[PDB]
């Protein structure tokens, strides 16, 4: 085991499968490397996930009191959240359904040795 800090972001207005597509870029990396990768990656879902990673780092800053530079994003994933249902009217009186999906991004970072 290694000392760990957690951060959760729930009900983020981003599809889970669109959050995972940038989560898969940064899994198992140092926090600073992950933050850089997210900051230059051209998909909008980076904005939530990046924040979540940073939030976790701060917890290890301020609640475990451990070294900034040893942090690695050990576990990160995106669960589905509640879906809102809407209607788009279509041709000849049809009415199709629209899903406004959300996500829960969870990150656990560990202070591994160098």
């Amino acid at each position: 085991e290694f000392p760990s800090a957690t951060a959760k972001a729930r009900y983020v207005r981003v599809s889970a499968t669109k959050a995972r597509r940038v989560i898969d870029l940064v899994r198992g990396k140092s926090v600073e490397e992950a933050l850089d990768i997210l900051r230059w990656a051209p998909q909008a879902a980076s904005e939530p996930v990046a924040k979540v990673i940073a939030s976790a780092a701060a917890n290890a800053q301020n609640n475990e009191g451990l070294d900034p530079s040893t942090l690695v994003v050990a576990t990160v994933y995106a669960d589905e959240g509640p879906t809102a249902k809407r209607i788009r009217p279509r041709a000849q009186g049809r009415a199709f359904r629209i899903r406004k999906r959300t996500s829960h991004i969870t990150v656990i970072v560990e202070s591994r040795p160098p």
Partner: protein, 54 residues
């Protein structure tokens, strides 16, 4: 046309797999005496201060 059968999990996950992103390749630059990482495309523009390193 219309799908004849519901498609299986193996075959669904086979081409959901191709929908991925690639991480940009970063290089190091020195701004205001401290080191930052930027794409090699934006290297010059960082070297003369036209990209906002937050």
């Amino acid at each position: 046309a219309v799908p004849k059968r519901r498609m299986s999990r193996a075959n669904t996950r086979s081409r959901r797999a191709q929908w991925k992103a690639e991480a940009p390749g970063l290089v190091t630059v020195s701004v205001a005496g401290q080191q930052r990482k930027v794409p090699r495309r934006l290297l010059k523009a960082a070297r003369l201060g036209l990209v906002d390193l937050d």
